[PDB]
């Protein structure tokens, strides 16, 4: 079963932390994918974006390893992207899924025009960059879907973005940089200070200092 | 660079007559048959997610 190795994992396993948002609010690093399984481990669906063979030339030939790019995320508010290189493809996919779980970020969603219903699109134009690949996400009116290439479309749909316009520049042919750039654009959604986030922050009791005795006696 | 062999392989391929098969549906019926094959029943699958024309 799950024997936590870290303080945050122990707190999560003991029902101490109510939601993943209490991890995100304090920018705590997640070092056990079992936390992601504990919180979203029923609505998470993965997707193997790519399997690519990388080769390193040696004395007697080329050592070939396989790199798996795997995107994960429940199609409501959360998404992650993991890359893992290994000798065996199945091992690479397992490692990529674990890394994708470890990298799951919250996706802030907003409205294009009026504010009826639940959010459907990104709150503003955001941009992610990865090694010459630039991905720009633009709010779109309700019902237009994702106007994008397949690779960013997968990550945007899996992040809960109902409809969105996109632009891309650079060598988007390299799927790894494309995926990392659109993931970066997605993860910048909650770091954009809009006037509705101007209200002064109210500091709450941090998870480590809130259940501090729960670990003192444990 | 001779031109003497111009219909070599096509000329020497053993002719096989086409079988007498039943006419296929056309139009709305064919689309209904495709929809039934692909979305309504899962009969031919083995759980391994192969292709429609897989010979293995």
């Amino acid at each position: 079963e799950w024997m936590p190795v870290t303080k945050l994992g122990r707190l999560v396993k003991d029902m101490k932390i109510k939601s993943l948002e209490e991890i995100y609010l304090f920018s705590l690093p997640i070092k056990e994918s079992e936390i992601i399984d504990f919180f979203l481990g029923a609505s998470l669906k993965d997707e193997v974006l790519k399997i690519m063979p990388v080769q390193k030339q040696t004395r007697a030939g080329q050592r070939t390893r396989f790199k798996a790019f795997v995107a994960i995320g429940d199609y409501n508010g959360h998404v992650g992207l993991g890359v893992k290189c290994s000798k065996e493809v199945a091992t690479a996919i397992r490692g990529a899924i674990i890394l994708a779980k470890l990298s799951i970020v919250p996706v802030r969603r907003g409205y294009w025009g009026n504010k009826i219903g639940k959010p459907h699109t990104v709150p503003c134009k955001v941009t992610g960059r990865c090694g010459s690949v630039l991905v720009r996400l633009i709010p779109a009116p309700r019902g237009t879907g994702i106007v994008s290439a397949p690779v960013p479309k997968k990550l945007l749909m899996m992040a809960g973005i109902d409809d969105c316009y996109t632009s891309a520049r650079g060598c988007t042919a390299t799927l790894g940089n494309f995926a990392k750039a659109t993931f970066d654009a997605i993860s910048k959604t909650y770091s954009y200070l809009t006037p509705d986030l101007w209200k002064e922050t109210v500091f709450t009791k941090s998870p480590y200092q809130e259940f501090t005795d729960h670990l003192v006696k444990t | 660079g001779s031109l003497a062999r111009a219909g070599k392989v096509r000329g020497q391929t053993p002719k096989v007559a086409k079988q007498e098969k039943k006419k296929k549906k056309t139009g709305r019926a064919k689309r209904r048959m495709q929809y039934n094959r692909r979305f309504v029943n899962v009969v031919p699958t083995f759980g391994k997610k192969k292709g429609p024309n897989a010979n293995s």
């Binding site: 193997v48 070939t64 | 391994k48 997610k49």
Partner: peptide
């Protein structure tokens, strides 16, 4: 026939595209 290692020892040969397509079909079949 197994796509998983078919891809592991055919990705450099004439059959790279077919085994890659089959492996992705196994992974996400829909």
């Amino acid at each position: 026939t197994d796509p998983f290692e078919d891809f592991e020892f055919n990705c450099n040969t004439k059959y790279s595209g077919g085994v890659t397509r089959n492996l992705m079909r196994e992974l996400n079949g829909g």
